[PDB]
Amino acid sequence: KKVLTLEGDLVLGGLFPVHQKGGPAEDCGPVNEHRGIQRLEAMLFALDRINRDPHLLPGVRLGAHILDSCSKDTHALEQALDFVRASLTAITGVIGGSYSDVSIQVANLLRLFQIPQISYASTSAKLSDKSRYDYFARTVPPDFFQAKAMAEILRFFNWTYVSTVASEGDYGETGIEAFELEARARNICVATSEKVGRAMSRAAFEGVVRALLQKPSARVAVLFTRSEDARELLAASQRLNASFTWVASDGWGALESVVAGSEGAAEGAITIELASYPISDFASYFQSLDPWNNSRNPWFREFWEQRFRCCAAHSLRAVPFEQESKIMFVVNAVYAMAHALHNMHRALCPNTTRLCDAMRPVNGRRLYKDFVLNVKFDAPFRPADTHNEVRFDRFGDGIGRYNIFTYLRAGSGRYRYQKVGYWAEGLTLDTSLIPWASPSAGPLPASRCSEPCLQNEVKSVQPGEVCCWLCIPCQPYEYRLDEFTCADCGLGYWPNASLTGCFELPQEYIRWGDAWAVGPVTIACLGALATLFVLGVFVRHNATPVVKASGRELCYILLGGVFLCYCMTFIFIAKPSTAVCTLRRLGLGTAFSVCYSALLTKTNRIARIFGSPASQVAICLALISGQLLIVVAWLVVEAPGTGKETAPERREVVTLRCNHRDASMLGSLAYNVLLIALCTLYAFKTRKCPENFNEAKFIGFTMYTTCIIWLAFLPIFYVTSSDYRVQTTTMCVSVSLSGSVVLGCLFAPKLHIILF
Ligand SMILES: N[C@](CC1c2ccccc2Oc2ccccc21)(C(=O)O)[C@@H]1C[C@@H]1C(=O)O
């Protein structure tokens, strides 16, 4: 119907919708000053203060073509064509559109004519296609940045398992996608993700609260929701007598109005709000205008029908205006496009203060791709009192500043918002103004998985949801290799206290206590006392010293074998070397053999004689060497050990033993000896032995006795292959006992009537 033109030399158009939503008999709706006058004036204001300030080229006035807009996309396109017709004097850019649908259709047309645009309250939900949208930008940052801020807030408080709720529309979907992308980048698991809105009614709002409340692994409701829909969730929360921490978009607006009716829903909730900074000059200019006399803006007459109770009797100054962030953005926007034109004038009309024909074709041809994008311009025409920029980057983007509030139980009044901090470039907060997180008060409820593992728990658990990483205890034969696993260190190696290393089954010998005062540790070193002294008795009693060892030994080899029995047994407890394995096979092998062999040999001489010492001895010794040489070959081919590692799941090792299965390596020597002992008793049928006494008494008593003793230990010695400990006494006793039994019976008859 009308265009609010402004006289000037160069003209910018715009869209600050006057009217809202209409119906079947109405082209569009009622007039609304929060879309209309407070923004229509913001541009007209800026244009004249721009026209007066020398930061614009001083001889060129910027006029206007403000489109007769309604908050409708269809309407905006039909009207936008008027800019196109003006440009086929003409339009050098358009500032306006209070909704993304208004901005998009106007821009869809204008881009084709190389005319740039500025938009408000529009988002990346649709305005992300820079391949076309580099022609224009928002002054108002897109809503999705708040979703990024939400993810940052949540990670800063270590909320890593959260519930995402967003509005039923495009705002909501955009917020969810942006949130989830940032949330994953920050290692935040999103426990739930859903849309809400007034359309689903109250039962559904309770259903949403119950969906999280009845699954309280997360305890924060992250709301990328417009104000009305948020109010219905908060009401549901109180109807259900419960609350969640809420983390909120600019749809909470820093306003008690979205909350306080169900204020208990929200205590300690955090809201991102779109930052707002006054220009006192507009508020003063604007509030002080009186269009009843000031012809600048005729659309006031329609707004006045409701602002004033009729009609010029009521001056404009009688009724106040809201100093909205929308004003700040519209004023700033005009300042940016104006300073882009200032640079465009220098670029196209460098020689004057007036216009040149170079700018007569629309200069939009150079503005949209350059001059209106590179616009921070170091805060030209004096914007809001940050004075930091108009906006930066402008890759379809607006300012990007957001403040952070919290909703506090100011119970002396109603629960209230207070300034915690801000985001914009990054998150800054006083957590003490957040009783959610405040020192010595903040419960930081749940909303993370039990990720920490016991230091002794490794195997990774992903119980359906990989978000909750849990651990399984390490098998104690393995050690920690990584956070999610143990490595096998060999079974005989169990994890150590170091976690990442292992405990080796130790090796040790003395396990015999008081109950074992009769064990190897006392046998091996004491049994010797019964026999080794004997050789000195013989020296005192060696009646024929004239006989050399080569013939003398015929009656001493047996004593030698007895003494060796004890010597070996002692070493077997005392010396944790290869020497013990070596000796169990080699020294012990004759120590016990001699105790029977010497007597078998004597017995057969007796059997042949009754009913030349050099050869008698050489034979007695040859019969001993014959077994030692088997063992030497064994020792050379199969070298002796110390430890005897086995049964690694539990077993301590000794260091004083063969690592070999012993079995027959000691066994066949022991069995040759048993057979010798029994052969002697057979040979003894010839019971006749005169030598000082009838020795038939003593050799009988001796061998009947030792044929029981040797035989007595063989059932253990060559059998209990499963044991680790009895063998020590099996050997200590069997051999040392045979030792004292034979001299104590054979030599003792003489030995102690002389040593009497
Ligand atoms: N459609 C939105 C609505 C956006 C908004 C902008 C200007 C004026 C009112 C207003 O309403 C809210 C309420 C909460 C969050 C964002 C907004 C848009 O106009 O750009 C935007 C997509 C996001 C959404 O759906 O929620």
What domains can you pick out in the chain, each with its CATH number? 4-142+278-371 (3.40.50.2300), 144-249+401-433 (3.40.50.2300), 457-504 (2.10.50.30), 514-754 (1.20.1070.10)
Listed residue (273, 195, 278) closest to 229, CA to CA: 195
Listed residue (350, 332, 370, 347) closest to 116, CA to CA: 370
The 3-state secondary structure of 325-359, one letter per residue: HHHHHHHHHHHHHHHHHHHHHHHHCCCCCCCCHHH
Query: Looking at the DSSP assignment, which residues form a beta bridge with residue 117?
Result: 94, 136
User: Do the Cβ atoms of 115 and 361 come closer than 8 Å?
Assistant: no
Listed residue (682, 693, 703, 687) closest to 595, CA to CA: 703
Token pair in block for residue 441:
């008060």
Contacts (Cβ under 8 Å, ≥6 apart) of 348: 356, 358, 359, 363, 366
Distance CA 618, CA 609 (A): 20
Distance CA 487, CA 493 (A): 11
Distance CA 312, CA 304 (A): 9
Cβ neighbours around 463 below 10 Å, total: 10
User: Do the Cβ atoms of 315 and 290 come closer than 8 Å?
Assistant: yes
Chain centre to alpha carbon of residue 70: 54
Listed residue (79, 117, 124, 73) closest to 96, CA to CA: 117
Which residue in this structure is represented by tokens 């150590």? Answer: 496
Is 250 known to sit in a ligand binding site? yes
Mutate to test the pocket of ligand 1, among 143, 176, 225 (most ligand atoms within 8 A of CB): 143
Scanning 53-99, the segments in alpha helix (DSSP H) are: 73-87
Listed residue (324, 148, 177, 124) closest to 247, CA to CA: 148
Contacts (Cβ under 8 Å, ≥6 apart) of 279: 327, 328, 331, 382, 383, 384, 385
**Amino acid residing at 360:** R
Distance CA 5, CA 302 (A): 17
User: Do the Cβ atoms of 332 and 375 come closer than 8 Å?
Assistant: no
Contacts (Cβ under 8 Å, ≥6 apart) of 558: 594, 595, 598, 599, 742, 743, 746
Q: What is the DSSP letter of 14?
A: E
Q: How far apart, in Å, are the Cα atoms of 586 and each of 383, 583, 622, 669, 673?
A: 106, 5, 15, 10, 14
Distance CA 599, CA 554 (A): 11
| CA-proximal residue: ligand 1, atom 22 (nearest) | 171
**Amino acid residing at 689:** C
Distance CA 593, CA 625 (A): 11
Scanning 684-695, the segments in alpha helix (DSSP H) are: none
- What is the resolution of the experimental data for this entry, in Å? 4.4
Mapped onto helix, strand or coil, the DSSP state of residue 456 is: coil
| Residue 120 Cβ contacting ligand 1 at under 6 Å | no
Cβ neighbours around 581 below 10 Å, total: 24
Distance CA 195, CA 186 (A): 22
Q: How many whole angstroms from 171 Cα to the centroid of ligand 1? A: 6
User: Do the Cβ atoms of 224 and 165 come closer than 8 Å?
Assistant: yes
User: Do the Cβ atoms of 246 and 223 come closer than 8 Å?
Assistant: yes
Cβ neighbours around 298 below 10 Å, total: 10
Q: How far apart, in Å, are the Cα atoms of 657 and each of 476, 503, 511?
A: 27, 22, 15
Listed residue (302, 298, 394, 380) closest to 342, CA to CA: 380
Q: How many whole angstroms from 197 Cα to the centroid of ligand 1? A: 13
Distance CA 370, CA 359 (A): 15
Instruction: Tell me the residue ranges of DSSP E strands in 181-268.
Output: 189-196, 220-224, 245-248
Which residue in this structure is represented by tokens 């519930």? Answer: 163
User: Do the Cβ atoms of 421 and 430 come closer than 8 Å?
Assistant: yes
Distance CA 569, CA 729 (A): 10
Listed residue (323, 332, 330) closest to 384, CA to CA: 332
Q: How far apart, in Å, are the Cα atoms of 351 and each of 58, 63, 277?
A: 13, 22, 37
| CA-proximal residue: ligand 1, atom 12 (nearest) | 226
User: Do the Cβ atoms of 123 and 374 come closer than 8 Å?
Assistant: no
Token pair in block for residue 91:
């339009």
Q: How far apart, in Å, are the Cα atoms of 212 and each of 125, 193, 222?
A: 27, 10, 11
Mapped onto helix, strand or coil, the DSSP state of residue 15 is: strand
User: Do the Cβ atoms of 710 and 679 come closer than 8 Å?
Assistant: no
**Amino acid residing at 162:** V
Q: How many whole angstroms from 13 Cα to the centroid of ligand 1? A: 24
Q: How many whole angstroms from 266 Cα to the centroid of ligand 1? A: 22
Q: What φ, ψ does residue 749 adopt, rounded to 5°?
A: -55, -50
In a 13 Å sphere around the CA of 83, the CA atoms on its Cβ side amount to 38
Contacts (Cβ under 8 Å, ≥6 apart) of 338: 46, 47, 50, 55, 56, 62, 380, 381
Which residue in this structure is represented by tokens 């359309």? Answer: 199
| Residue 168 Cβ contacting ligand 1 at under 6 Å | no
Helices 588-609, 726-746: inter-axial angle, 10-degree rounding: 30
Listed residue (10, 742, 2) closest to 367, CA to CA: 10
Mutate to test the pocket of ligand 1, among 124, 171, 252 (most ligand atoms within 8 A of CB): 171
Q: Max alpha carbon distance in the chain (Å)?
A: 166
Is 511 known to sit in a ligand binding site? no
Cβ neighbours around 41 below 10 Å, total: 26
Backbone breaks in the chain after residues (C–N over 2.5 Å): 88, 310, 611
Q: How many whole angstroms from 437 Cα to the centroid of ligand 1? A: 29
Q: What is the DSSP letter of 152?
A: H
Query: Looking at the DSSP assignment, which residues form a beta bridge with residue 418?
Result: 406
User: Do the Cβ atoms of 413 and 419 come closer than 8 Å?
Assistant: no
How was this model experimentally determined?
cryo-EM
Cβ neighbours around 52 below 10 Å, total: 11
| CA-proximal residue: ligand 1, atom 21 (nearest) | 171
Contacts (Cβ under 8 Å, ≥6 apart) of 56: 50, 62, 338, 339, 341, 342, 381
| CA-proximal residue: ligand 1, atom 25 (nearest) | 171
Is 524 known to sit in a ligand binding site? no
| Residue 92 Cβ contacting ligand 1 at under 6 Å | no
Listed residue (171, 169, 176) closest to 200, CA to CA: 169
Token pair in block for residue 18:
């006057």
Helices 696-717, 664-683: inter-axial angle, 10-degree rounding: 150
Query: Looking at the DSSP assignment, which residues form a beta bridge with residue 472?
Result: 459
DSSP labels for 256-316? GGGTGGGGGG-TTEEEEEE-----HHHHHHHHT--TTT-TT-TTHHHHHHHHS---TTS-G
In a 13 Å sphere around the CA of 457, the CA atoms on its Cβ side amount to 10
Cβ neighbours around 115 below 10 Å, total: 30
Distance CA 267, CA 238 (A): 12
Token pair in block for residue 252:
């909470």
In a 13 Å sphere around the CA of 298, the CA atoms on its Cβ side amount to 8
DSSP labels for 360-409? SS-THHHIIIIITTS--TTSTT--STT-S-S-S--SS-----EEEEEEE-
Mapped onto helix, strand or coil, the DSSP state of residue 507 is: strand
Distance CA 676, CA 688 (A): 20
Burial of 690 (0-12, 13-18, 19+ CB in 10 A): exposed
Listed residue (691, 716, 45, 26) closest to 331, CA to CA: 45
Mapped onto helix, strand or coil, the DSSP state of residue 683 is: helix
Is 500 known to sit in a ligand binding site? no
Distance CA 412, CA 394 (A): 45
Distance CA 380, CA 90 (A): 25
Contacts (Cβ under 8 Å, ≥6 apart) of 439: 431, 432
Is 123 known to sit in a ligand binding site? yes
| Residue 250 Cβ contacting ligand 1 at under 6 Å | yes
Cβ neighbours around 516 below 10 Å, total: 14
Mapped onto helix, strand or coil, the DSSP state of residue 122 is: coil
Q: Residues 203, 207, 208, 210: is their CA dihedral positive or negative?
A: positive
Distance CA 247, CA 154 (A): 8
Distance CA 651, CA 662 (A): 18
**Amino acid residing at 155:** R
Which residue in this structure is represented by tokens 């569009």? Answer: 28
Q: What φ, ψ does residue 121 adopt, rounded to 5°?
A: 50, 40
Distance CA 373, CA 375 (A): 5
Atom of ligand 1 nearest to the CA of 251: 14
| CA-proximal residue: ligand 1, atom 11 (nearest) | 226
Q: How many whole angstroms from 91 Cα to the centroid of ligand 1? A: 29
CA angle 161, 164, 169 (to 5 degrees): 165
| Residue 249 Cβ contacting ligand 1 at under 6 Å | yes
Q: How many whole angstroms from 120 Cα to the centroid of ligand 1? A: 10
Which residue in this structure is represented by tokens 């013939």? Answer: 551
Distance CA 83, CA 547 (A): 144
Token pair in block for residue 607:
């059997």
